[PDB]
Every structure is written in structure tokens, then in C-alpha cells.
């Protein structure tokens, strides 16, 4: 117990000095109106706060479903083959069996999904970790939608694949952190919202 | 310092929480010093509540001069801010 | 009798009570007795006009 008391009485001062030093080193670093993080001299510390430009208060852990799925399971959960698959129209108010343009849209969707899975598994989270803090709890919003609209699992939906693709693309186009018609502004916007876009596309696959 | 054109503005179109606090405080301070109120009063006596109800109706006659790191700035009306 | 036509500047502080439609008439008279955007002075509420 004496050792414990001594450790307390010393650690208090140690950490007090550490915190004063830490605050003095970064007191001038502030987020600017162009999205960049700079110090009092204008030197850029980061080009986007946290590399995504989000307040740490508002982020919540989300699970990436496509990361740990096998290729077979990934295909099962995301691949739509209207030529071989007919169960899709069983879930829909409108028949889309053997439709060419809809199949083209689905193929573009699946190509983007496979690209996103490749980028996740190879570049971002090669260790296979799926739970990461992102903006917006999308799963909670989906649960809220299921509860609010009394969605009956037995009721065919009036949503067409094109509706889903266009809506998700427009949403992704409305997640603006950086504004500007330049090229590197587009690049930084895409990078900042890349992981969120991957999660959104994995959640809202047709 | 050069003023940016209204069409060229690149900053966020939303009112920041710091901007909201500053705007409410400044308008409340001006009201406390007998600045004419641009909203109908239902018997409120606190200048801060008067400024809040002015804000809800976007009736605060104030601008925000957001400065870019290089010194160029953008003027945003409290009314047009989201 | 050398008379010079010159452009000059002054910094007028205005009380919040005057912040109405007739703000600019008041400033001109004050300038004559003694227009840029009005900078609201932090902590005081006045508006500085150049």
C-alpha cells in the first residue's frame, strides 16, 4: 500500500508536466475555413482534420460487412444475375427478368463493389479488421427506417434497381466536405469520403 | 485582403456552432443596448431569448466575415446561412 | 490661395440604438459635424465604419 501511495504522489506531478508540455506544443493548431489544419504561422499540419475532416464527437463504430465475407459469400450477397437468378422479381412489384439495361447497371454496381472490396482487403485493412468509427450510424438509420415504415418482409417493394443506384450516387455526391471545381479538390473530397462511400455501397447494394 | 465574389465562395454554407454562438451573443448584446428588434415580441425580457427568436426567423442583421488563411475573406449573411 | 481637393478617411463608431434604416444619414451628419461595412466591435457592440 505504501508503494501505491508513493506511485500516486509521483505520477500526479509527472502527468501534470506532460500535459502542460503537450498543450503548449499544439495550442495554436486550429481548423481553418478551407478545411486544412494549420498552426499560427499558417504552416499546414494536415490537409484535412483527421484525414477525413470530421468531428470526433459525432463518429460511431460501424462494421464493414464485405471485408470478412469470402468470395463465394460476397458473390451470393452482392452478385445479381438476372439470366440465372429469378428470385429478385419474387421480391419486387415489377418484373425485371432477362432485362438488359438493368443487368448492365447491376454489372457496373458489382464491379464497383469488387473494386471497393479489393481496396479494403489490400490497401486499407489488410489485417481484416472490420469495425471502425465512421460518420453516421447507417445500420441504426436502417433499423429506424424498418421500424418507422412498418416494413413487412412479405410485401414486394416498388423500388427499381435504377432507383437505388441513382439515389445512392446522388447521396454520395451530396457528402461535401471540400468545395471547389479544381482537380485536387475533387481528389481530396473523394479521398476524404472514400471509406464512408465503401460502407454506403456495401450497405445499400441492390 | 480581397473580398471573394458571392459565386466563388468555397466555405461551408452552414452556420458553424462557433458562428452561431458569436452571432447570438453579438445580437443579444446589441439588443440589450436598445438596438431595434426585427421580430415581434411576445413579452420576452431576456435579450438572448429575443436574439434566439430573431435567429429562428433569420431576422438577425449581421454578417460573418470568414477569413481564409491567405487573408482573402467571404461575407455570409446570417439569413442565407443554413 | 492654394485649395487642395483630397480624399480622406475617418473611423466612425455607432451605437446599436442607431442600427436602423436611417443609419447612413446619421453617419454622414456626424462626419460633416466632425461608407464602409460596419465592423461590430467584440465585447462592446458598436459598429466601426471607415
Amino acid at each position: 500500500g505504501r508503494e501505491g501511495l508513493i506511485d500516486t504522489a509521483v505520477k500526479t506531478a509527472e502527468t501534470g508536466y506532460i500535459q502542460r508540455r503537450l498543450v503548449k506544443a499544439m495550442e495554436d493548431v486550429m481548423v481553418r475555413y478551407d478545411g486544412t489544419v494549420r498552426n499560427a504561422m499558417g504552416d499546414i499540419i494536415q490537409f484535412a482534420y483527421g484525414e477525413d475532416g470530421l468531428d470526433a464527437t459525432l463518429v460511431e463504430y460501424q462494421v464493414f460487412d464485405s471485408l470478412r465475407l469470402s468470395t463465394k459469400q460476397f458473390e451470393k450477397k452482392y452478385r445479381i444475375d438476372l439470366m440465372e437468378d429469378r428470385s429478385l422479381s419474387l421480391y419486387m412489384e415489377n418484373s425485371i427478368e432477362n432485362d438488359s439495361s438493368v443487368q448492365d447497371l447491376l454489372d457496373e454496381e458489382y464491379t464497383q463493389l469488387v473494386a471497393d472490396r479489393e481496396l479494403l482487403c489490400k490497401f486499407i485493412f489488410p489485417k481484416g479488421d472490420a469495425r471502425w468509427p465512421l460518420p453516421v450510424n447507417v445500420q441504426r438509420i436502417i433499423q429506424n427506417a424498418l421500424q418507422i415504415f412498418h416494413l413487412e418482409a412479405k410485401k414486394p417493394t416498388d423500388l427499381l434497381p435504377s432507383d437505388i443506384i441513382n439515389g445512392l450516387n446522388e447521396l454520395i455526391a451530396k457528402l461535401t466536405i471540400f468545395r471547389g471545381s479544381d482537380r485536387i479538390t475533387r481528389d481530396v473530397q473523394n479521398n476524404a469520403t472514400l471509406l464512408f462511400q465503401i460502407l454506403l455501397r456495401s450497405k445499400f447494394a441492390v | 485582403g480581397k473580398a471573394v465574389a458571392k459565386e466563388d465562395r468555397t466555405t461551408t454554407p452552414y452556420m458553424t456552432k462557433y458562428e452561431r454562438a458569436r452571432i447570438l451573443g453579438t445580437r443579444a448584446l446589441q439588443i440589450s443596448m436598445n438596438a431595434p428588434v426585427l421580430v415581434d415580441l411576445e413579452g420576452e425580457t431576456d435579450p438572448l431569448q429575443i436574439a434566439m427568436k430573431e435567429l429562428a426567423q433569420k431576422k438577425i442583421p449581421l454578417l460573418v466575415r470568414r477569413y481564409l488563411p491567405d487573408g482573402s475573406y467571404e461575407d455570409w449573411s446570417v439569413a442565407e446561412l443554413i | 490661395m492654394p485649395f487642395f481637393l483630397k480624399e480622406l478617411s475617418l473611423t466612425i463608431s455607432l451605437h446599436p440604438s442607431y442600427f436602423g434604416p436611417r443609419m447612413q444619414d446619421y453617419l454622414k451628419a456626424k462626419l460633416l459635424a466632425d461608407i464602409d461595412k460596419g465592423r461590430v466591435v467584440p465585447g462592446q457592440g458598436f459598429a466601426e465604419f471607415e
Binding site: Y33 | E19, R22, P61, L62, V64, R65 | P21, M23, K37
Partner: peptide, 15 residues
């Protein structure tokens, strides 16, 4: 809260 400056909009004070 002081990362910006507040100005009057006289266009609104007219109306």
C-alpha cells in the same frame, strides 16, 4: 468563437 468577424448587413436593415 473569435475565428471570424461580425459585420452589419445594411441591406437587411433597410428592409
Amino acid at each position: 468563437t473569435g475565428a471570424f468577424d461580425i459585420y452589419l448587413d445594411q441591406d437587411m436593415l433597410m428592409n
